Amino acid sequence: ALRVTSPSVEYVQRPLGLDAAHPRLSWPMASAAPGRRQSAYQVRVASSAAGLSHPDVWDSGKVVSDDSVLVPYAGPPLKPRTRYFWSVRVWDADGGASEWSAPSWWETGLMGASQWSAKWISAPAPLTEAPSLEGSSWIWFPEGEPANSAPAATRWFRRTVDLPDDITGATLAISADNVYAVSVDGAEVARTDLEADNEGWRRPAVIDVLDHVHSGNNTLAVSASNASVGPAGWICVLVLTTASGEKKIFSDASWKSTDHEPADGWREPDFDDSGWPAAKVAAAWGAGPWGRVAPVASAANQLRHEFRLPHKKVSRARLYATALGLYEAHLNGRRVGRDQLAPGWTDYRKRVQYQTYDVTSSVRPGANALAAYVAPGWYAGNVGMFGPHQYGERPALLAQLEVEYADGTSERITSGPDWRAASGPIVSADLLSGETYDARKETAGWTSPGFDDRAWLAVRGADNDVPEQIVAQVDGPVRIAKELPARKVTEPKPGVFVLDLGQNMVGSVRLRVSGDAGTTVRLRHAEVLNPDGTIYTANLRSAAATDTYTLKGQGEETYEPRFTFHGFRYVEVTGFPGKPSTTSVTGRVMHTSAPFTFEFETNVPMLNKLHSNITWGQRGNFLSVPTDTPARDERLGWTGDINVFAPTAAYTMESARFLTKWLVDLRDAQTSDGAFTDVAPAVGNLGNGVAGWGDAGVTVPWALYQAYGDRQVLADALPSVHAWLRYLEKHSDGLLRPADGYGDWLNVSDETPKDVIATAYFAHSADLAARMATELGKDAAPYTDLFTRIRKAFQTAYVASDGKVKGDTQSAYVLTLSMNLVPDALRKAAADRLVALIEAKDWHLSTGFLGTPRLLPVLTDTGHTDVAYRLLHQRTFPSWGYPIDKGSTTMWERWDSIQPDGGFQTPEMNSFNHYAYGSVGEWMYANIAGIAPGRAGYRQVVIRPRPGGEVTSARATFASLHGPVSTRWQQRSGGFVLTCSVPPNTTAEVWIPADHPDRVQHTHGTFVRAEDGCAVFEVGSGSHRFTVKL
Ligand SMILES: [Ca+2]
Structure with a gap:
C-alpha cells in the first residue's frame, strides 16, 4: 500500500508562528510497489491530535485530484496564536485508501499588527550615542578665515588643563579637516594619516584615554594638517567622568597655536608656549562647511525586565519578538532559541519580520526575568560601502511574552517604559567592522530574576519610524549549521598566529583563552593568504572584519560573537597569552535554516570538489538575503548574481522559502516606473533597469516554479513582471534596448555588446511572462505577441545571414541559442561558430556572469556534450579546475582572482566567494546525475x-x-x-x-x-x- 511520509506545511515540518491565511500542505508518499498515482485526498484539521477523528476545524472530504504538493488550506478562517493539528490520507489509482498520516501540526502567529500590545523600546541616549562634539568649536591657527580657506599646511596646538579629582572614566572624541595627531602629557593617543584620508573629518574617532589622564594639570597637544588649499579646522571634546557628574574640555580659544614647526619637547608639559597666539575658532559645531558631524556608536546594549507570574500550572508560553536592529533574547538565565542575527534584513520602512519561540518550559511561578541584547545590524550599522544609519540611528526592540494557564487565564508581559538598560560587555557590534567585547563589563546574573539593576537606566520609547507591516519571518532564520575546528596553527611573524579552518566559511568563531584580566585578543578574518603565510585582507576594502575580546581572568574563557559575521578561511590571532592551539578557535558556520537537498558523487575527485565548492559558495551567501559576497564591505542582495545562480541553488538547498522572501524584498524595491533595482533591499543609490540584473524579478520566480512547481510564486510575481515589461518597452526604440548595463560581467577578454545583451534579456522576459500567464490559466497572447515582436527586431539587428551574431563572442552565441533568439535555420551555424571560438581559445571558455550559466547547457542542446565535458574537466586558466588546483573551497568572483603569475587581482573588486560561476552546478545535476x-x-x-x-x-x-x-x-x-x-x-x-x-x-x-x-x-x-x- 501507499503511505504518507513527512507531511509539511509551507515547506517545513511543524512551523511555529506561521501567518499564511491558506497554508500550503504537502504529502510525499512512499510505496514498495512501482507505478503509483494519487486519485484522491482528504485533509482533516482539528484543535487536537485526538480530535482528528471528529474534526472541529476542517474536513475537505474526499477530493478527486492528483495534487499532493502545496495544496492550500481551504477551510474556515484561521485564528491567531492557535495550534492546528492535521492529517491526510489518499487513494491510489485503484481506490485503496492509505492510513491517515501520523498527526502533525502548524501554529499561527499573531496574524496582524492589532495583536501586538508591546511598545518599541531603545536604550537611552547615554548608552546609544557616542560622546558628542556638541558644545565644542572647530579651531585652527589664527590665519584668515579657516572655515572658508586655509593654506595646505600643518599647524600645532597646545592646552594645559586642570582636571578634577577621582576620575573614573575619560573619553576623547576628535575630528579634523584633514588629519590630526593628538597626545596627552607627551604620549600620542590617536592619529589619522594624510595618505589614508578620504574626508575623514566626517567620521570623528572616540578614544578611551583613562590610561593617560590624571587629576591636576594635563597637557594636551595636537598637530593637524590641511591637505590642500581650502577649509581647515579640528574639533574635540575630552569628557571626564567622576561620581559627581561629567566635566567637558573643548577645542576653543583657550588653546595656544603656532604656524612654525616647534622645537622638540612641544608635546611635553613644561614646553614654553607663552609666545604662541590663541587658537582661532573657525566655526562652532554645526557651523562652517562641516555640519552636524557626530561620532558613531555601535554598542549592543542590555535591556531587561523582571516580573511576577502566578503559581498556577502553565499550559503554554510564547515569545514573539523583533528588532529594528538585531536582538538576542534571554528568559530566566537561558538564551531563547537558536537563531543568529534575528530578525534579518528587510526594507524596515515597509516591513520587519518577527520570530516566535516556544518558551513553555522556561517560565516560572513567581519571579521571572526577560532580557535582550539589542544591536545596530543592518538597520543602523554599516551596510555595504555606504556607512551606518541606513534606516535609523538607534536600535529598538519589540517583545511580547504570552503565558496561558491550564485554568484558561493568561498573562502578557511586554517591552515598554518599565524596562531598564545598561551598556554591558558588547562595546561595539557591526556587521562589517566586527564586534568588540570586554568581559570585565559583564553583569553576572542579569538574565535571571533577583538581579540588582537599581543603577541601570530607564529605557526610552524608540523614535524610529514604525514599519508599515510586522510579518512572521518567511525565510528560515539564520542558525549555526556546523562547526569547523582549526586544522592547523602557524606563526608567520612573532606572536601573530594564523589558524586555518580548511574551508572558506561564513559566520564567526568561538575563541577559548585563559589569561590575565585585561588581556586583549584580536581576531582578524581573511579569505586567502599572502605567499609569506600572513593573512591578506586588502580585498575586504573598508570591512575590518575584526573581533576584539578583553579577558576577565576567569579560567578557560569562551568568547562567541553575536552581532557580526565574516567570510573567511583563516583567522589571525594577536595578543593571545602564550600559544594558541587548534582548540583555541572553531568556526561556527551560519546560514538560513534550510536543508541541503542534493547529494552528488562521481568517480572524479575534481568534480566532487567542484560540487562541494558550489554548496559552500551558496550557503555562505544565503544569510537573510542572497548576497554577492559575505566578506568585503558589500554583502548586498544583487539581482544579477541570483538571476544566474537560482536554478543551481534550487537543486542544492531548499531555496523556496529563502527566495520567496527575497522576491518580496525585490518587489518592495521596484521603482514607481516599474524598474527592478540592481540590489534588493535597495540601499546606497545603486541603479535600476539593468538587463540580466533587474530580470531576476522574472527569472527567479520561474526558476522556483521549475524546481518546486510553486504556482503561488508565479501569481505573486506576475503583476511586477507586467510592470517591468512595460518599463522595458518604454525604454527601447523599435524594441531594441540601449547598450547600457553591466553586460556579460567579468568575461575573459571577450566583451559582448551591451545592446545585444539588453535586447536578448527583454525578449526572454517577455517569453517567460507568456509561460507564467499560461501556467496560471491567464491570457498569454499579449506576452507571446510581445516576445514574437522582440525576437524579430532582435534577429534583424544582430543576426547575420550566415548565423553570426554581433560581437562574435562566446556569450553572444550562448545567449541567443539559449533564449531561442537565433532563427531555427541558423542554429546549427551559430552553434558551430561557438564551438569554433572555444576551439580557438585552446578549449577554454571566455564567458562572464551572464554567459557562463547557459554555456554547458547550450553546448549539450546543440549536440556538443563532448565539448561541454572538455570545458568541464579543463584544469588550465580560465576554467573551474584552475581555482580548484589553487586550493579554492568556494567559487571566486573572477576567473583569475588569483592570477596565473601567482598575484591577486585588484583589491578594488576581488572576492573569493561569489556563487555566480557555481551556476555550472545545474548542468552537472541535469546531465551527469541525469x-x-x-x-x-x-x-x-x-x-x-x-x-x-x-x-x-x-x-x-x-x-x-x-x-x-x-x-x-x-x-x-x-x-x-x-x-x-x-x-x-x-x-x-x-x-x-x-x-x-x-x-x-x-x-x-x-x-x-x-x-x-x-x-x-x-x-x-x-x-x-x-x-x-x-
Ligand atoms: Ca581641508
Whole structure:
C-alpha cells in the first residue's frame, strides 16, 4: 500500500508562528510497489491530535485530484496564536485508501499588527550615542578665515588643563579637516594619516584615554594638517567622568597655536608656549562647511525586565519578538532559541519580520526575568560601502511574552517604559567592522530574576519610524549549521598566529583563552593568504572584519560573537597569552535554516570538489538575503548574481522559502516606473533597469516554479513582471534596448555588446511572462505577441545571414541559442561558430556572469556534450579546475582572482566567494546525475545521464517536494547499468545510451522510441533498473 511520509506545511515540518491565511500542505508518499498515482485526498484539521477523528476545524472530504504538493488550506478562517493539528490520507489509482498520516501540526502567529500590545523600546541616549562634539568649536591657527580657506599646511596646538579629582572614566572624541595627531602629557593617543584620508573629518574617532589622564594639570597637544588649499579646522571634546557628574574640555580659544614647526619637547608639559597666539575658532559645531558631524556608536546594549507570574500550572508560553536592529533574547538565565542575527534584513520602512519561540518550559511561578541584547545590524550599522544609519540611528526592540494557564487565564508581559538598560560587555557590534567585547563589563546574573539593576537606566520609547507591516519571518532564520575546528596553527611573524579552518566559511568563531584580566585578543578574518603565510585582507576594502575580546581572568574563557559575521578561511590571532592551539578557535558556520537537498558523487575527485565548492559558495551567501559576497564591505542582495545562480541553488538547498522572501524584498524595491533595482533591499543609490540584473524579478520566480512547481510564486510575481515589461518597452526604440548595463560581467577578454545583451534579456522576459500567464490559466497572447515582436527586431539587428551574431563572442552565441533568439535555420551555424571560438581559445571558455550559466547547457542542446565535458574537466586558466588546483573551497568572483603569475587581482573588486560561476552546478545535476524536471516541480522527471569526459560512474539523490529522486549509473567492461528511484505520484522519462536500442533490459516501464543513441523509456514511480551488456 501507499503511505504518507513527512507531511509539511509551507515547506517545513511543524512551523511555529506561521501567518499564511491558506497554508500550503504537502504529502510525499512512499510505496514498495512501482507505478503509483494519487486519485484522491482528504485533509482533516482539528484543535487536537485526538480530535482528528471528529474534526472541529476542517474536513475537505474526499477530493478527486492528483495534487499532493502545496495544496492550500481551504477551510474556515484561521485564528491567531492557535495550534492546528492535521492529517491526510489518499487513494491510489485503484481506490485503496492509505492510513491517515501520523498527526502533525502548524501554529499561527499573531496574524496582524492589532495583536501586538508591546511598545518599541531603545536604550537611552547615554548608552546609544557616542560622546558628542556638541558644545565644542572647530579651531585652527589664527590665519584668515579657516572655515572658508586655509593654506595646505600643518599647524600645532597646545592646552594645559586642570582636571578634577577621582576620575573614573575619560573619553576623547576628535575630528579634523584633514588629519590630526593628538597626545596627552607627551604620549600620542590617536592619529589619522594624510595618505589614508578620504574626508575623514566626517567620521570623528572616540578614544578611551583613562590610561593617560590624571587629576591636576594635563597637557594636551595636537598637530593637524590641511591637505590642500581650502577649509581647515579640528574639533574635540575630552569628557571626564567622576561620581559627581561629567566635566567637558573643548577645542576653543583657550588653546595656544603656532604656524612654525616647534622645537622638540612641544608635546611635553613644561614646553614654553607663552609666545604662541590663541587658537582661532573657525566655526562652532554645526557651523562652517562641516555640519552636524557626530561620532558613531555601535554598542549592543542590555535591556531587561523582571516580573511576577502566578503559581498556577502553565499550559503554554510564547515569545514573539523583533528588532529594528538585531536582538538576542534571554528568559530566566537561558538564551531563547537558536537563531543568529534575528530578525534579518528587510526594507524596515515597509516591513520587519518577527520570530516566535516556544518558551513553555522556561517560565516560572513567581519571579521571572526577560532580557535582550539589542544591536545596530543592518538597520543602523554599516551596510555595504555606504556607512551606518541606513534606516535609523538607534536600535529598538519589540517583545511580547504570552503565558496561558491550564485554568484558561493568561498573562502578557511586554517591552515598554518599565524596562531598564545598561551598556554591558558588547562595546561595539557591526556587521562589517566586527564586534568588540570586554568581559570585565559583564553583569553576572542579569538574565535571571533577583538581579540588582537599581543603577541601570530607564529605557526610552524608540523614535524610529514604525514599519508599515510586522510579518512572521518567511525565510528560515539564520542558525549555526556546523562547526569547523582549526586544522592547523602557524606563526608567520612573532606572536601573530594564523589558524586555518580548511574551508572558506561564513559566520564567526568561538575563541577559548585563559589569561590575565585585561588581556586583549584580536581576531582578524581573511579569505586567502599572502605567499609569506600572513593573512591578506586588502580585498575586504573598508570591512575590518575584526573581533576584539578583553579577558576577565576567569579560567578557560569562551568568547562567541553575536552581532557580526565574516567570510573567511583563516583567522589571525594577536595578543593571545602564550600559544594558541587548534582548540583555541572553531568556526561556527551560519546560514538560513534550510536543508541541503542534493547529494552528488562521481568517480572524479575534481568534480566532487567542484560540487562541494558550489554548496559552500551558496550557503555562505544565503544569510537573510542572497548576497554577492559575505566578506568585503558589500554583502548586498544583487539581482544579477541570483538571476544566474537560482536554478543551481534550487537543486542544492531548499531555496523556496529563502527566495520567496527575497522576491518580496525585490518587489518592495521596484521603482514607481516599474524598474527592478540592481540590489534588493535597495540601499546606497545603486541603479535600476539593468538587463540580466533587474530580470531576476522574472527569472527567479520561474526558476522556483521549475524546481518546486510553486504556482503561488508565479501569481505573486506576475503583476511586477507586467510592470517591468512595460518599463522595458518604454525604454527601447523599435524594441531594441540601449547598450547600457553591466553586460556579460567579468568575461575573459571577450566583451559582448551591451545592446545585444539588453535586447536578448527583454525578449526572454517577455517569453517567460507568456509561460507564467499560461501556467496560471491567464491570457498569454499579449506576452507571446510581445516576445514574437522582440525576437524579430532582435534577429534583424544582430543576426547575420550566415548565423553570426554581433560581437562574435562566446556569450553572444550562448545567449541567443539559449533564449531561442537565433532563427531555427541558423542554429546549427551559430552553434558551430561557438564551438569554433572555444576551439580557438585552446578549449577554454571566455564567458562572464551572464554567459557562463547557459554555456554547458547550450553546448549539450546543440549536440556538443563532448565539448561541454572538455570545458568541464579543463584544469588550465580560465576554467573551474584552475581555482580548484589553487586550493579554492568556494567559487571566486573572477576567473583569475588569483592570477596565473601567482598575484591577486585588484583589491578594488576581488572576492573569493561569489556563487555566480557555481551556476555550472545545474548542468552537472541535469546531465551527469541525469535529474531534471520534465514537468514543473518534477511531476515528471527526465532521467538522461550523458556519460562523457572522465566520468564513468555517478550517484545522486535530489530531495524533491514529492520525495527522493535518486540515480546511480556505471559504465564498465562495455556494459551500462542505471538504477533509479522515482517517488509515488510522479513519472519519469528515462534515456539509456545503447548501440542497439531494443536490446536494453529493463525491470519496469515501456520502451517508446530510439533517439540520439538511446532507448527512451516511460516509467511510473518505484525502483527501476536498466542494463545494456555488450
Ligand atoms: Ca581641508
